Amino acid sequence: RKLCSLDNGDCDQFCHEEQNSVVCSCARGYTLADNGKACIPTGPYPCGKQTL
């Protein structure tokens, strides 16, 4: 295990290695957080979230 191979490289969602370093990204509806690892819901109903 290494990088994205280890705990999704700590990304909330999409992870993708590239030159020994991790890069996080989110599906549409979510904007990347400060830490650049979490994914912040843009709208009230981002995809993939049950409505409670």
């Binding site: 969602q13 999409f14 109903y45 995809c47 993939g48 979230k49 049950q50 409505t51 409670l52």
Partner: protein, 234 residues
């Protein structure tokens, strides 16, 4: 679905239902985005004219949340073939945009490379729909959902008396009597990752339902990620 529980208020927002002229649910669907619905191609031949209903959990008792949208465009995969069900996928464009609320939300679409390696290698995934509760039984009127473990490709191809193309994948149980069935077709197969759900499959077919030695055959959605985006682009 055969087994599993019924979707509780909010659990299966991305669920979509295909209704024919007589307003009956024959197939399932997945909410991709306000204007787009994912479904199986083989469903397209189940009705001469049909519409889509969303946010419904009890076909026979309106919850004021339902919503019926007319299909504006049908984007089927020209390479699909009834002979093998290969390329069993389709996207639908709605005349009117959907409005996300309590039981009406879209599933997320992943990245093939990430999906195949992260999601797809999860322990299990979840399928849902108003399908038959028993192989030879009748359609359910309660939206249902069931957690299906992923099946090894080899084991899959091998356990099937049919050709498991590369646009398909097994999920379900070896002997346990839990598996999707007719009516859930075109339905959503999703995989949770940190409490976020991604569309990972499309209920396609099976040598019956829950049958011992037979699994559930779904349309590997990652293989059409590129095809799906484009279908939406226009």
């Amino acid at each position: 679905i055969v087994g599993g529980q019924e979707c509780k208020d909010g659990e299966c927002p991305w669920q979509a239902l295909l209704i024919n002229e007589e307003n009956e649910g024959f197939c399932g669907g997945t909410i991709l985005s306000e204007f787009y619905i994912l479904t199986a191609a083989h469903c397209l031949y189940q009705a001469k004219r049909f519409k889509v209903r969303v946010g419904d959990r009890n076909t026979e008792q309106e919850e004021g949340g339902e919503a019926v949208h007319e299909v504006e465009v049908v984007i089927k995969h020209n390479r699909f073939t009834k002979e093998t069900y290969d390329f069993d996928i389709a996207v639908l464009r709605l005349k009117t945009p959907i409005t996300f609320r309590m039981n009406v939300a879209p599933a997320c679409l992943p990245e093939r490379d990430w999906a195949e390696s992260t999601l797809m290698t999860q322990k299990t995934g979840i399928v849902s729909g108003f399908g038959r509760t028993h192989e030879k039984g009748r359609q359910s009127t309660r939206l249902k959902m069931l957690e299906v473990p992923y099946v090894d490709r080899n084991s899959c191809k091998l356990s099937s008396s049919f050709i498991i193309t590369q646009n398909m994948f097994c999920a379900g149980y070896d002997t346990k009597q839990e598996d999707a069935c007719q009516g859930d077709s075109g339905g959503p197969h999703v995989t949770r990752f940190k409490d976020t759900y991604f569309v990972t499959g499309i209920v396609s077919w099976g040598e019956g339902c829950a049958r011992k030695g037979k699994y559930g055959i779904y349309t590997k959605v990652t293989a059409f990620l590129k095809w799906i985006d484009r279908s939406m682009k226009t």
